[PDB]
């Protein structure tokens, strides 16, 4: 019985899968092609676990999950036995996304809850949490993705149809908002920064209004460029939008039971692939 898992994540080396469903449990599997052997079940949430997410193995085996009970739960495998080492629930509503930073930033976490907040939880020397939060969106935040870089930034997708790009500032000590972008007529479900250290940067912003805008910034200066992936509404509401590391392929999880794939061509416009 597992009729509706909401999220699954793969580890750096892809040996250990972590699905999370609505029955609150987070199941850990030892994958091996056809055979993912169930190795664990983790019960510690008071509502459907929306998302799970491993951290960089530089930090051992850590997994921050966020669930409907408004609480972010950090887990850790310890000698082959899992244990909830920390927790961070400074959010007064259902926590939706949770995504670790680039490991060069430390062990930073990115939480994004319906109380219009998004936190960046550091784990200090005592391993204890150091929350520095910001208000992100009015009617709630559905997602928040990290950006790689070599001047840190992230993106957030809102319930007010916004897509925001925040940046760290030593003057403020809290992430200062630097640019917001408007293009959807309904809850911005998911937002994704692309890991392509190439000439430009790409953002795929899927939404409830069955659109997927792509914000391509020329460089550090010139603002973004709006590009409706295709100019027809998808047969059903879109949920997830993920970039590929090698290649800059875009995967779109629409509520129409297939996942589409879009690649950029020399026109600059995007074309299906599969």
């Amino acid at each position: 019985h597992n009729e509706l898992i909401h999220d699954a994540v793969l580890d750096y080396y892809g040996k250990r899968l972590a699905t999370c469903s609505s029955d609150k449990t987070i199941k850990i599997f030892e994958v091996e092609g056809e055979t993912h052997k169930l190795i664990d079940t983790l019960t510690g949430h008071e509502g459907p676990v929306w998302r799970v997410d491993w951290a960089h193995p530089k930090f051992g085996t850590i997994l921050a999950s966020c669930s409907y009970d408004g609480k972010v739960l950090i887990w850790k495998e310890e000698n082959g036995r899992w244990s909830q080492i920390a927790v961070h629930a400074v959010h007064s509503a259902s926590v939706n996304s949770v995504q670790w930073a680039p490991h060069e930033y430390g062990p930073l976490l990115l939480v994004a809850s319906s109380d219009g907040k998004v936190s960046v939880v550091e784990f200090k020397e005592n391993g204890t949490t150091s929350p520095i939060i910001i208000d992100a969106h009015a009617i709630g935040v559905n997602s928040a993705s990290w950006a790689p870089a070599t001047s840190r930034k992230f993106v957030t997708g809102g319930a007010d149809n916004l897509v925001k790009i925040w940046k760290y500032n030593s003057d403020a000590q809290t992430y200062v908002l630097e640019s917001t972008l408007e293009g959807h007529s309904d809850w911005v479900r998911d937002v994704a920064w692309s890991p392509t250290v190439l000439l430009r940067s790409y953002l795929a912003s899927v939404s409830q209004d069955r659109t997927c805008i792509i914000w391509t910034q020329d460089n550090e200066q010139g603002p973004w460029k709006k590009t409706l992936l295709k100019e027809e509404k998808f047969p059903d509401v879109l949920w997830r939008a993920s970039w590929s590391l090698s290649g800059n392929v875009l995967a779109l999880s629409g509520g129409d039971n297939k996942v589409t794939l879009w690649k950029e061509n020399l026109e600059g416009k995007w074309e299906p692939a599969g």
Binding site: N2, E3, L4, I5, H6, D7, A8, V9, L10, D11, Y12, Y13, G14, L17, T19, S21, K27, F29, V31, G33, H36, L38, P57, K58, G60, T61, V197, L198, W239, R240, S242, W243, S244, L245, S246, G247, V249, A251, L252, S253, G254, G255, D256, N257, V259, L266, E267, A273, G274
Partner: protein
């Protein structure tokens, strides 16, 4: 509701209520369709053809010499496949010819090399058009037409023979000139044609065609074979330009270009594309870019191989950015095919040092395990993968699976924690000395053997959990062993139970 993101090992997990986990490990459909790529022997022999030098802006490998030729791939393909035709024709036009016999001066050499190349190209075209024309000769009902068709197969001798046999003797003699570029004969043939095409009550339809061939400009003309556009493969007519056409006066390139200027080729046809890139000479890249946005006849792999050959043979010129673009694209396709060694090899042909560094690093660390199996995987990590990167990656794989020599080559404290024998300690101390945290060093020095300072240092380290307690217990045991009055009391100032028993 559905969910799907991309894997580290670029592949896709989606909601799937048919498995066991509630997700599906999908092997991403690879555009990379070319068999020999999945066989590791090809890759080994391909690395044998390269000279790798470290960069002048970082230690990461990038290619200094390549001897790859379109020629080389041909062994791994069927001589029957259209692919083989593409690679072969590409070899004929682009791979350098060698001329073994010594030549009086070097401009001569150049001329010979041109004749050789020309002869191979035209023999090949004849290989292709062969059956088309033979079919046409099968169906002709007129001898002079057959003679013409034999000229279409660049067979001057059988044209001459049939002429002879069909009692067309003068023509026969004339025919013998086809392929000597005698300008006298050229202007004479053209003259005869104008005289006919000004009065000339009637001339046989195929004799005029043959004269037009002798004219050296069979479409470029006023009795033009251009209308044969509708009766013959474009390649067949191009053969006519290349064989007759004005061989000596033109370079192979500008000749081919001359022909192409008279006829549009189908956008989708790739052997067409190769001729266009060959003829385009002065702006191959320009055309290549044009070819890119118009068709997909040239695949990712081919475009990369092409660009690389031309680059490393001085044959042609491509932007650092276009060569890198091609290289990225192919490396990516390869990585989608779980061909990490091969993607790694390709990634080295990057010009941009920064990007090479990132790509390489990222991939090696993410995929170290697979890249350390056979010797064909060894030569791989003996591309010039930086010592640092390899062991570093390997260090990561150990922390995550739960090493020390690599570390010797915070984290160090955690390693000491895990270690918590005497010989190993001594070796560690020697390594630390070679490298030259301080507290731990003081403790080690004490163990090998001021005492109060070492004690304070150790206490501070303990404060900075299980390993620290173990170290504290060890220190206590050592102190107890040493004891076996005021100074002793000063040094002193389950563990609690032990302390109580001591008091």
């Amino acid at each position: 509701y559905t969910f799907a993101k991309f894997s580290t090992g670029s592949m896709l997990l989606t909601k799937d209520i048919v498995g066991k986990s509630g997700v599906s490990i999908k092997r991403l459909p690879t555009e990379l369709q070319r068999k020999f790529l999945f066989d590791d022997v090809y890759l080994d022999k391909e690395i044998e053809k390269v000279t790798i030098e470290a960069r002048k802006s970082n230690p990461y490998p990038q290619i200094s010499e390549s001897s790859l030729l379109f020629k080389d791939a041909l062994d791994y393909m069927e001589k029957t496949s259209s692919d083989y035709n593409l690679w072969k024709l590409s070899s004929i036009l682009f791979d350098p010819v060698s001329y073994p016999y010594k030549t009086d001066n070097d401009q001569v050499k150049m001329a010979l090399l041109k004749k050789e190349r020309h002869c191979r190209l035209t023999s090949w075209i004849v290989s292709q058009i062969g059956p088309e024309i033979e079919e046409k000769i099968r169906n002709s009902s007129n001898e002079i037409e057959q003679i013409f068709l034999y000229l279409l197969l660049n067979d001057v001798v059988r044209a001459s023979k049939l002429a002879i046999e069909s009692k067309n003797g003068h023509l026969s003699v004339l025919i013998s000139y086809l392929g000597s570029n005698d300008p006298r004969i050229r202007d004479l043939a053209e003259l005869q044609l104008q005289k006919w095409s000004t009065g000339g009550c009637s001339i046989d339809k195929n004799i005029s065609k043959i004269y037009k061939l002798l004219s050296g400009s069979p479409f470029e003309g006023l009795f033009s074979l251009k209308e044969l556009e509708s009766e013959f493969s474009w390649l067949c007519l191009l053969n006519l330009t290349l064989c007759y056409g004005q061989i000596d006066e033109y370079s192979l390139e500008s000749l081919v270009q001359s022909h192409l200027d008279k006829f549009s080729l189908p956008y989708d046809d790739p052997i067409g594309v190769i001729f266009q890139l060959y003829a385009a000479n002065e702006n191959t890249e320009k055309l290549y870019k044009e070819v890119r946005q118009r068709t997909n006849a040239l695949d990712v792999q081919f475009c990369w191989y092409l660009i690389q050959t031309l680059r490393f043979n001085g044959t042609r010129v491509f932007s650092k950015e276009t060569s890198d673009e091609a290289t990225f694209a192919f490396a990516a396709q390869l990585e989608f095919a779980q061909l990490h060694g091969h993607s790694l090899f390709v990634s080295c042909f990057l010009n941009d040092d920064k990007a090479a560094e990132d790509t390489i690093k990222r991939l090696v660390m993410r995929e170290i395990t697979l890249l350390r199996a056979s010797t064909n995987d060894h030569i791989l990590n003996r591309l010039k993968i930086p010592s640092q990167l390899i062991f570093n990656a390997q260090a990561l794989k150990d922390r995550y699976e739960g090493s020390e020599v690599q570390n010797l080559l915070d984290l160090a404290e955690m390693a000491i924690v895990t270690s918590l024998v005497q010989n190993n300690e001594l070796k560690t101390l020697r390594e630390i000395l070679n490298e030259f945290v301080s507290i731990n060093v003081f403790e080690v020095y004490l163990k090998l053997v001021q005492e109060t300072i070492d004690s304070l240092i150790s206490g501070m380290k303990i404060f900075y959990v299980a390993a620290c307690c173990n170290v504290m217990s060890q220190e206590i045991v050592s102190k107890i062993l040493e004891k076996n009055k005021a100074k002793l009391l000063e040094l002193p100032l389950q563990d609690l139970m032990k302390c109580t028993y001591k008091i």
